[PDB]
Amino acid sequence: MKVRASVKKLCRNCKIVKRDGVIRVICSAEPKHKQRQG
Amino acid sequence: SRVAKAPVVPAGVDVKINGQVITIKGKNGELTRTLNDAVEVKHADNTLTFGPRDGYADGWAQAGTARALLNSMVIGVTEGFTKKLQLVGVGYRAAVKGNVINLSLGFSHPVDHQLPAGITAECPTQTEIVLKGADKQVIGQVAADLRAYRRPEPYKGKGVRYADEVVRTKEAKKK
Amino acid sequence: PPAAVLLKKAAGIKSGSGKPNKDKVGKISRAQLQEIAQTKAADMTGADIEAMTRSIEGTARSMGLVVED
Amino acid sequence: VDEASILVVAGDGGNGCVSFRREKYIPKGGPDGGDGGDGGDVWMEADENLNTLIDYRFEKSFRAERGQNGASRDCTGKRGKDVTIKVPVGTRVIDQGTGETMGDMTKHGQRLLVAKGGWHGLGNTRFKSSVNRTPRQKTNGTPGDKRELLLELMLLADVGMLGMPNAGKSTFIRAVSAAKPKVADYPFTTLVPSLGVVRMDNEKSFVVADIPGLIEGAAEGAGLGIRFLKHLERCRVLLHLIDIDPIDGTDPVENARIIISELEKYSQDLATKPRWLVFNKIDLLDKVEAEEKAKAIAEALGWEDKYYLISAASGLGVKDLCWDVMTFIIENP
RNA sequence: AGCCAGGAUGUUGGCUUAGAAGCAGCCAUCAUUUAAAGAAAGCGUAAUAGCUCACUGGUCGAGUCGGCCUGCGCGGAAGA
Known part of the structure; x- marks a missing residue:
C-alpha cells in the first residue's frame, strides 16, 4: 500500500477492486502491487 | 442477468x-x-x-x-462444498481428537478449536482433515476461522490453508 | 530428421542468415524438397501430397533458403 | 553478477539567522542564533546473511541531511549524519577517489570509515567584520558528502564455482554442508544468482556461490547462456571442479590441465593468488584417494591455490581444510 | 458471461546461444488438417519445452460489445 491520488491498473495482474473510498489493485498473481486510496 | x-x-x-x-x-x-x-x-x-x-x-x-x-x-x-481443510507442512499437529484438533509451530499453549455440527470431521492424518458439508455460508465462515489460526507462509508454503488450495511457494527468494 | 534440418543438409549450409528470408545463405532444389516432403508426408496429418510440399517449402523459405529447382 | 559503485551523501550546512530580537518594550534587535547543519561520513559494514533483498530494491543510491536555522526563540540548528552501507554477503573496499583499495576483506563484522564533513551554512557572523548588521539570513553554502565508493562482493557472492560439463556443484556443497543453500540477491545490473551454504564446522557458516540460475559450468560455454556466462566469469575467486574419481568423461588429468591453463591464459596472477581448486565427486570416493590427487594437483601448481575439498568423506584434517579454503577466499586482495 | 473441445500437424522455423527454435536480443511469423487448431498473447522457461490462452468448431440458446457526446452525484481531503 502507498499514498496515491491516481488509480489505473498496472498490469493485468492488477484488476481494480473497489472497497468504496479506497481502491486497491491486488490481484492473485501479484498482490505485490497494492494501492490505498483512490 | x-x-x-x-x-x-x-x-x-x-x-x-x-x-x-x-x-x-x-x-x-x-x-x-x-x-x-x-x-x-x-x-x-x-x-x-x-x-x-x-x-x-x-x-x-x-x-x-x-x-x-x-x-x-x-x-x-x-x-455443501467444505469437506476438507488441509495444511501444508509436517511436524505440526492437525488430527481430530473429539471436537478439538491441535496445531503447533512449537506452540507453548495448545492451539485448537471445537466443532459444531455441519462441519464434523475425522482423519487419520496430521496433514489432511476431512470435514463435513452443510449450509454453504455456515461451513464457509467456520472453514475460514480454522485456517486463520495460521495463515499460509510462502517461503516453503507451510501454514494451514483453507478448504481450497490457497498455498503457493510464493517465496521472497530467500532461505 | 526434420524438414528444417533436411533442407539445410541438402543445401549444404548448417547455419542460417543473420536475418532469414531478408537474407539467404543457400538455395534448395525442388527435387530435394519434394522427396523430403514425401518422407515428412508420413509425419504429417495431411490429406494429400501437395499439403506436404507446401509445408516443407514454407520451412525452406523462412530459414533463408531459396526454393527453386 | 555485477559489482557496484555507490554514491553516498551525508549531512550538510546550516541556514543563518533570519532573526530580530523581539521586545514589546524595545522595537527590533539583531540576529541571535544562526545556521544549523553539518554531516557525517560514509562507513561500511560486512555481513554473513542476506536474507532481506535490499539490492533488488534499489532506488538510485545513498542520500543524507541538509541543515537548519532556528529563530524562535533565538536559535541555531543541529547536525546531519553518517550513512552506512550494507551488501548481501561481504565486500572488499575500494574508492574510485583513491583509485585503489583501502581495507582488504570480505571478512564480516569489519567496518571501515571513509571520512569527511565540515559543511557549513552562511550565518550572519560570516559577513561581519564588526560593522555589519545582517539580521536576516536563511542561507547555506556547502553540499553534503560526495564520494564514489567501489564495492565488489568478490562475487558471484564471494566465490564463484566455474565447472565444466561434468560438474555437479550444488549436490557436493550439500553433502559437505549441513547448511542449506539460499537463492541470493545482490546489487546487480544483471540477473541475481544461486547461493549454496557451506559448513565451516566451527559454529560459523560460510556460503559458496554457484553458476547463474541453474548450473552449466562456465567452460561449457553458457552460465545459463552467453549473457549469464558473462555474469559468471566476473568473480575474483574462480573454482575448478573436476571429478577426481577415475571418471570425469574428459579424464581428470586432462581436465585439470585444460581448466588450469585456461585460467592461467586469462591471468596467471589468478592462478598464483588465493583462487582455489575444489575437488569434487567424492560422493563416489571415500577421500583417501581423492585427497591424494587433490593435494598432488594443488602442489603441482607450484603456487598458492592449493586444494579445496567439497563432498564429504574421511577426517584427514579435511573439515579443517574446507574451512581453510573458505577463509583464504575471505581474506581478499 | 460461462461450459465441452480441437487443442493436431511440417514444427520445438532459423540466426545468436550448448540449448535462445510463438513469448531475452536479432529475423523469419510460412504452410497443412477439419465443422474446428495462431510458427502460437501472457505466465513460465537463458530460450524452447510446459501451463493457460486471444485462434476456432460444438454447447447452454437470444439479443449483445465497445466508442462518441451529456445531466447530477463520488473518491482526492491532515492540527492544537
Missing part, C-alpha cells in the same frame, strides 16, 4: 415462505434461513422466483443473490 430473473426444487426440499426470509425445510438439513432486503418471494417450490419487492433497483442485486442462496440451501441440505 439470466439468473436474477431466470429460475427446480424436488419434493425432498420444501419451503416456508416469508417476505425475504427464505426458510427451507427438507432432509439432511432443514430449518435453514437466509434473508435479503429487496426481494419478493414468489412461491413455486420448483425454484422460487425473485425480484424487487415494490420496485427497487437493488432488487435484482438481491434477486440473483436470493436465487443462488435458495440454491445454496438446496445444496446445503445435501451437503
